[PDB]
Write a protein that binds this ligand. Structure first.
Ligand SMILES: NS(=O)(=O)c1ccc(O)c(NC(=O)NCCCCO)c1
Ligand SMILES: [Zn+2]
Length: 257
């Protein structure tokens, strides 16, 4: 099965998922001088006031905080998107060291981690249909740098002891994802893919310019999770990021100068 090790990591994925070598793969390096400011880009509309978090799950590759997506409760609109996209889950990718962990890079700079708020286009009816469409998902990507703590992340950090190993889940209600957002919603955007298998080319990526700061203790607690299931040999869940992929025939657009 695929993963992030020496024998099943990102350089192996194409053998089971040939789209790994496709034309719109993610993540990418964001060359800030080559991105083009698009003044027609609209401000992002993040409407998370009615969000209903349900549960947090260790799936063996990351942890997902899952939301009720059966109504328009937490939606992303505007920006480059047409229509309404519903929040289904968020998760992170992170490193073994503070100098690495993000999937996207900014002028080759790697951040300590990257948050992915995953949304699907309501015109396709459900997430499974949406991932089969070139405009099916919108993933809002937010970089994490190590510095001051992020208070809105702490409820996530504190529950991780309950989901240490693959397949463990915990109730996780009343979590407000607005506590994970930076001040500015300035963003870069480009067409891309899921960054884990099945690597489907269904994502409008929206990557925020401004990182959030989290404390060293917060990211340390991410690194105590396990890729393995309970009663299996312990592999720390670290470096669960795919490196930057070729940009090919794509232009990254910026909502700001
Ligand atoms: N990193 S991402 O581009 O924001 C991303 C957003 C939504 C996704 O569905 C995936 N891929 C995925 O879930 N693959 C199957 C493993 C889960 C079952 O345990 C990746
Ligand atoms: Zn992700």
């Amino acid at each position: 099965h695929w993963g992030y090790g020496k024998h099943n990591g990102p350089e192996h994925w194409h053998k089971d998922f040939p789209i790994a070598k496709g034309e719109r793969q993610s993540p990418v390096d964001i060359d800030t001088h080559t991105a083009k400011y698009d003044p027609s880009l609209k401000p992002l509309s993040v409407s998370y006031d009615q969000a209903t978090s349900l549960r947090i799950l260790n799936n063996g590759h990351a942890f997902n905080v899952e939301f009720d997506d059966s109504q328009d409760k937490a939606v992303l609109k505007g920006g480059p998107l047409d229509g309404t996209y519903r929040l289904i889950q968020f998760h992170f990718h992170w490193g073994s060291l503070d100098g690495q962990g993000s999937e996207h890079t900014v002028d080759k700079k790697k951040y300590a981690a990257e948050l992915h708020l995953v949304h699907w286009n309501t015109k396709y009816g459900d997430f499974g249909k949406a991932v089969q469409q070139p405009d099916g998902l919108a993933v809002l990507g937010i970089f994490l740098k190590v510095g001051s703590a992020k208070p809105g992340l702490q409820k996530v950090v504190d529950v991780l002891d309950s989901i240490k190993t693959k397949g463990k889940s915990a109730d996780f209600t009343n979590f407000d994802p607005r506590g994970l957002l930076p001040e500015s919603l300035d963003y870069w955007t480009y067409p891309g893919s899921l960054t884990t298998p099945p690597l489907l080319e269904c994502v409008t990526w929206i990557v925020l310019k401004e990182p959030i700061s989290v404390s060293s203790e917060q990211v340390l607690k991410f690194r105590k999770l396990n890729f393995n299931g309970e009663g299996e040999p312990e592999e720390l869940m670290v470096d669960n990021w795919r490196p930057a992929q070729p940009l090919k025939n794509r232009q990254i657009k910026a909502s700001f100068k």
